């Protein structure tokens, strides 16, 4: 009942005040099986791609974070080839940053920010991370080509 009331409010806010570039909605009729979309940001290599994500709300929400993975392939130091995301707010403390005062909208915004600003210090993709650090022009070209191939 606690989780239910919280999800109703989140779905209302996602429907009426979505963050710029972000959409999140119910796949069907269950408030804990959600989908989202993040628009590729301008001045990023993902520009003019559209990235779909799966947003699964666990039983203990809001005390456990949403489980979010990219469905659209993306070329990024912190996102693996299955769409898993390495991001602090998707993880529980002490290492992670999730807390019940965050919500689906804030963490989708954090993923959007991660797309703009990767964290080569916490890589999931070692070869992409090294390319991002030491050969940024190649990283940007590869990230654009992957966006053309899979997100457009
Ligand atoms: C988009 C959005 C804006 C906003 O202010 N909130 N607040 C909550 C909360 F508190 F219900 F979890 N969800 C949201 C979502």
From Swiss-Prot:
Changing residue 86 to A: Loss of E2 enzyme activity. Residues 2-152 form the UBC core domain. Changing residue 5 to R: No effect on FANCL-binding, nor on FANCL-dependent monoubiquitination of FANCD2. It catalyses: S-ubiquitinyl-[E1 ubiquitin-activating enzyme]-L-cysteine + [E2 ubiquitin-conjugating enzyme]-L-cysteine = [E1 ubiquitin-activating enzyme]-L-cysteine + S-ubiquitinyl-[E2 ubiquitin-conjugating enzyme]-L-cysteine. It comes from the Eukaryota. GO terms for biological process: DNA damage response; DNA repair; protein autoubiquitination; protein K11-linked ubiquitination; protein K27-linked ubiquitination; protein K29-linked ubiquitination; protein K48-linked ubiquitination; protein K6-linked ubiquitination. Disulfide bonds: none annotated. Changing residue 60 to E: Loss of FANCL-binding and of FANCL-dependent monoubiquitination of FANCD2. Induction: Down-regulated following hypoxia. Up-regulated in breast cancers. The active site is at 86 (glycyl thioester intermediate). GO terms for cellular component: nucleolus; nucleoplasm; nucleus. Changing residue 2 to E: In FANCT; abolishes FANCD2 monoubiquitination; abolishes interaction with FANCL. There is a cross-link at residue 91 (Glycyl lysine isopeptide (Lys-Gly) (interchain with G-Cter in ubiquitin)). Its EC number is 2.3.2.23. Transmembrane segments: none annotated. Auto-ubiquitinated. In contrast, according to another report, autoubiquitination does not affect E2 enzyme activity. GO terms for molecular function: ATP binding; chromatin binding; ubiquitin conjugating enzyme activity; ubiquitin protein ligase binding; ubiquitin-protein transferase activity. Belongs to the ubiquitin-conjugating enzyme family. It is linked to Fanconi anemia complementation group T: A disorder affecting all bone marrow elements and resulting in anemia, leukopenia and thrombopenia. It is associated with cardiac, renal and limb malformations, dermal pigmentary changes, and a predisposition to the development of malignancies. At the cellular level it is associated with hypersensitivity to DNA-damaging agents, chromosomal instability (increased chromosome breakage) and defective DNA repair. This is Ubiquitin-conjugating enzyme E2 T. The lineage of its organism: Eukaryota, Metazoa, Chordata, Craniata, Vertebrata.
């Amino acid at each position: 009942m606690q989780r239910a009331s919280r999800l109703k409010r989140e779905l209302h806010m996602l429907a009426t005040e979505p963050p710029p570039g972000i959409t999140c909605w119910q796949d069907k009729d269950q408030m804990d099986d959600l989908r989202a979309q993040i628009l590729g940001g301008a001045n990023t290599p993902y520009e003019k791609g559209v990235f779909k994500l799966e947003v699964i709300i666990p039983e203990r929400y809001p005390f456990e974070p949403p489980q979010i993975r990219f469905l659209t392939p993306i070329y990024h130091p912190n996102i693996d080839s299955a769409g898993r995301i390495c991001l602090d707010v998707l993880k529980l403390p002490p290492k992670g940053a999730w807390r019940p005062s965050l919500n689906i909208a804030t963490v989708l915004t954090s993923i959007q920010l991660l797309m703009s600003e990767p964290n080569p210090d916490d890589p999931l993709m070692a070869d992409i991370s090294s390319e991002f650090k030491y050969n940024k022009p190649a990283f940007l070209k590869n990230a654009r080509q992957w966006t053309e191939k899979h997100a457009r």
